[PDB]
Design a protein around this ligand. Structure first.
Ligand SMILES: CC(C)(C)n1[nH+]c(-c2ccc(Cl)cc2)c2c(N)ncnc21
Length: 264
């Protein structure tokens, strides 16, 4: 229906990079709009998994989530057409341009992600890999969360199996790495790690340690230290995301309103 786009109305231009689940190309849609098109190869992911994903992305429209326009699914490679977010990946942006940012700009990046995540949370979805590598930066430095192939339906205070794509353990809550289960607060833990990445200008978390070491250290109570550019108030907010128990972590709704008075 409205989800299907006219393939002849998409012209692909240069490769932008890769992520997911697929190479991403810059494109033009209807000879007017700049788009980023993800290529879904035949066999790369399931046919029926694709429909559920495309529908979920279409449903979840928010200014802080990558805008989905439609798909070209009649032939392979399947196109996933989205808005082109000109400054690309947040992680690369922090690494290349982070020194030029004010701490108030770093907080605004965290606020943007939180606002998009509060929207997902209000719809009973979690993000399975909330990290700077899955966020994009637009021309005005507004941050958008990329959620394709990385969401999971979970009712509040309930647990669901972690079975599927194994995402980086340094962004994983203990219920994930220990019990192979997601809670409605598993992405809140990841969001605290994302705030740490932002305020650290894209440094790797626990950079001295292997994944095996991190699982042990985190189980023992060890946490990431305060990034130099983070105020103690901002550190207390990220730190609150890392309670061993999901019940003790804030929701994104609480995080959002905690960040709101600290802006500019
Ligand atoms: C990887 C990188 C940074 C080149 N990348 N990836 C996406 C993107 C496109 C479609 C989907 Cl479905 C998900 C993400 C993207 C975008 N929209 N704008 C700019 N860079 C993008």
């Amino acid at each position: 229906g409205h989800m299907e786009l006219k393939r002849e109305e998409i012209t692909l231009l240069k490769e932008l990079g890769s992520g997911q689940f697929g190479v991403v190309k810059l494109g033009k849609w209807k000879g007017q709009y700049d788009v980023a098109v993800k290529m879904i190869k035949e066999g790369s992911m399931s046919e029926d998994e694709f429909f559920q994903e495309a529908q979920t992305m279409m449903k979840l429209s928010h200014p802080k989530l990558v805008k989905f326009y439609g798909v070209c699914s009649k032939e392979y490679p399947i196109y996933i057409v989205t808005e082109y977010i000109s400054n690309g990946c947040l992680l690369n942006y922090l690494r290349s341009h982070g020194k030029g940012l004010e701490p108030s700009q770093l907080l605004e990046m965290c606020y943007d992600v939180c606002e998009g995540m509060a929207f997902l949370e209000s719809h009973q979805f979690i993000h399975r890999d909330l990290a700077a590598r899955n966020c994009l930066v637009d021309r005005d430095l507004c941050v958008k969360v990329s959620d394709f192939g990385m969401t999971r339906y979970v009712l509040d205070d309930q647990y669901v199996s972690s079975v599927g794509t194994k995402f980086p353990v340094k962004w994983s809550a203990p219920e994930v790495f220990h019990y192979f289960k997601y809670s409605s607060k598993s992405d809140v833990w990841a969001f605290g790690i994302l705030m740490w990445e932002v305020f650290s200008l894209g440094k790797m978390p626990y950079d001295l340690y292997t994944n095996s070491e991190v699982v042990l250290k985190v189980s023992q109570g060890h946490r990431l230290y305060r990034p130099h550019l983070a105020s103690d108030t901002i550190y207390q907010i990220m730190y609150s995301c890392w309670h061993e128990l999901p019940e003790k972590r804030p929701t994104f709704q609480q995080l959002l309103s905690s960040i709101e008075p600290l802006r500019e």
